[PDB]
Amino acid sequence: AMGQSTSNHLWLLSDILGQGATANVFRGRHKKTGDLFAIKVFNNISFLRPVDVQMREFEVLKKLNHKNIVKLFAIEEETTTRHKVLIMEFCPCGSLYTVLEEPSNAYGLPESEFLIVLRDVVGGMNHLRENGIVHRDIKPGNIMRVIGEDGQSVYKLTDFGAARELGTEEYLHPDMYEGATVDLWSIGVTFYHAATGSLPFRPFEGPRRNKEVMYKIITGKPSGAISGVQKAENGPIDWSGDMPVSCSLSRGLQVLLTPVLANILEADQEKCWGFDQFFAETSDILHRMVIHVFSLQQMTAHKIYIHSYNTATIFHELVYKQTKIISSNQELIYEGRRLVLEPGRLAQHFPKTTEENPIFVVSREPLNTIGLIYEKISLPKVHPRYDLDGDASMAKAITGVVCYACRIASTLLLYQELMRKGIRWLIELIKDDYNETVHKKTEVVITLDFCIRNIEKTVKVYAAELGEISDIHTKLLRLSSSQGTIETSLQDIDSRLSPGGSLADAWAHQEGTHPKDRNVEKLQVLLNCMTEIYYQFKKDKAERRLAYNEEQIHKFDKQKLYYHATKAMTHFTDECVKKYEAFLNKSEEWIRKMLHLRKQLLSLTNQCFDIEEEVSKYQEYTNELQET
Ligand SMILES: CC(C)Oc1cncnc1-c1ccc2c(c1)N[C@@H](Nc1cc([C@@H](C)N3CCN(C(=O)CC(F)(F)F)CC3)ccn1)N2
């Protein structure tokens, strides 16, 4: 229907993207070119109208250009109203707030996506700081997303510098609710929200007329606690200086991210960081690369963040911080071959590793098997009330839980398939140690046997030495005999290394789950059915009221969403989880049987080397006879 216009651009007010206090932005096009731009039509601008200062202000912001900041192309005045309109580049993909509405990120964004936002936000925020311009109000609803040429998102800043001539309540700083840290506060709240999927400080009901408690939480924040939430009405505050279990981030990343947030989330400027320390420590985190490590004994995958110029000694040490294995017993395997790392080798030249093909870590010393430990979350109660707004929030919650369950279920299958290979490779590598012990033993055996005969023949070729010649002769059979006693014990190990030898991995090819089971794809089918219903309830919430037929289909759909969820989690716990714990139970035992075999065969190999010294002495010594 009706739609406003300008000299160069036009748009209909139906296509609405954002409703701000001073303005409204809609989806618009250029009057020749037809390209999309965001139209900021200023509403109620007369008592201001500083065509004096804002002219110069917006002209300055126009040429201000960077890849991580929304570009202001032009400022025009409307035809029908003489209103001033900023025309900016259109971000097709929404804001960070829109992505956090997605249930897949209800418990936090993917680790990779978190690094993109973090990198872009700081760089954009840093570009305005070099110009002195500073924001304070940075919020996911104010951080837009577009898709870059490489396909991965690029985040930009967009509605800053609007606080001089005339913070989100949840992202406000304690003293400003009623410098250096006051900047950094809303960003840390943003970063906690992108990693966890929820806000740091939460009263029980929430941000309403009982919001005085919230302010006490912020003002009562002890130490380097990054979060504080009361789980009951008017109850105590559960404080924590670490991140939750539902966090999709790797544990190695949390160790570096935690100090940043603890130091950038505190009201006192005495003990809190500046933009320089902040830019330094996070930029420190982004330049490090990731090397994927799977501890095969304990079944835990790891992401070690290292600078490319760091050595392999701190690498073993940092690995000790996550697997707690001392560097000298840590043994690496890669692409099924053992891997030798010099203590001073740089990380740039490490082999290329992924989570589906990492560097395995094995230890001779026993280690407990932990597995993936994630937080068990059940479904919430579905009320029969028709509150569409309530039905929408409940849809995001219940669908996000199954998203979490489906990611873990996808992680558990990865762990098993990874366990299965690392086990199959390990035995062929330890048998190579077995291929090598008889190996090196054959050098001793024929030299020894013939050596005894030369001494056993010289008695025929030719009282004093004859009595001991026999005695050395007894000892040479004492050792040829012991060469004979261990020889029997190594073929016994060979019977177990053989298929069906009580060490085979056939158990691993049976108990757990496989991609052939297709258990993860099955849950995404039901989970997709649920999200469209979710995005539909938002669409019904936007109407505020629905016609009759649609309200009853909405009541039909809201009930199938519960039935879908129960169907998936039941398939999750009764098939995927249980068959995983059974694969984990038989996993600790087989390593015990493998590490036991590795220590005995170990000894037999040194006993064979133990013996080599004895035949190296009799090799010479007695043939070492001196004579004119
Ligand atoms: C909101 C306030 C902070 O906004 C500003 C304030 N100050 C300065 N700049 C901005 C500013 C600048 C650039 C842009 C935005 C805001 N919003 C942004 N794009 C968009 C895209 C979207 C995404 C979900 N899709 C929605 C469907 N869809 C439409 O077209 C529907 C239609 F057809 F009905 F329109 C295509 C777009 C959402 C929100 N913003 N792009």
Swiss-Prot record:
Major localization class: cytoplasm
Alphabetic keyword roster: Amyotrophic lateral sclerosis, Antiviral defense, ATP-binding, Coiled coil, Cytoplasm, Disease variant, Glaucoma, Host-virus interaction, Immunity, Innate immunity, Isopeptide bond, Kinase, Methylation, Neurodegeneration, Nucleotide-binding, Phosphoprotein, Serine/threonine-protein kinase, Transferase, Ubl conjugation
A Pfam cross-reference name: Pkinase
Phenotype for residue 52 to A: In IIAE8; decreased expression levels
SUPFAM superfamilies listed in its UniProt record: Protein kinase-like (PK-like)
Consequence recorded when altering residue 381 to R: Decreases ubiquitination. Abolishes ubiquitination, phosphorylation and kinase activity
Residue intervals of the Ubiquitin-like domain: 289-365
Effect of residue 551 to A: Decreases kinase activity
Binding-site residues for ATP, renumbered to this chain: 17-25, 40
N-terminal signal peptide: none
Name by which UniProt lists this protein: Serine/threonine-protein kinase TBK1
Species for this entry: Homo sapiens (Human)
Gene: TBK1
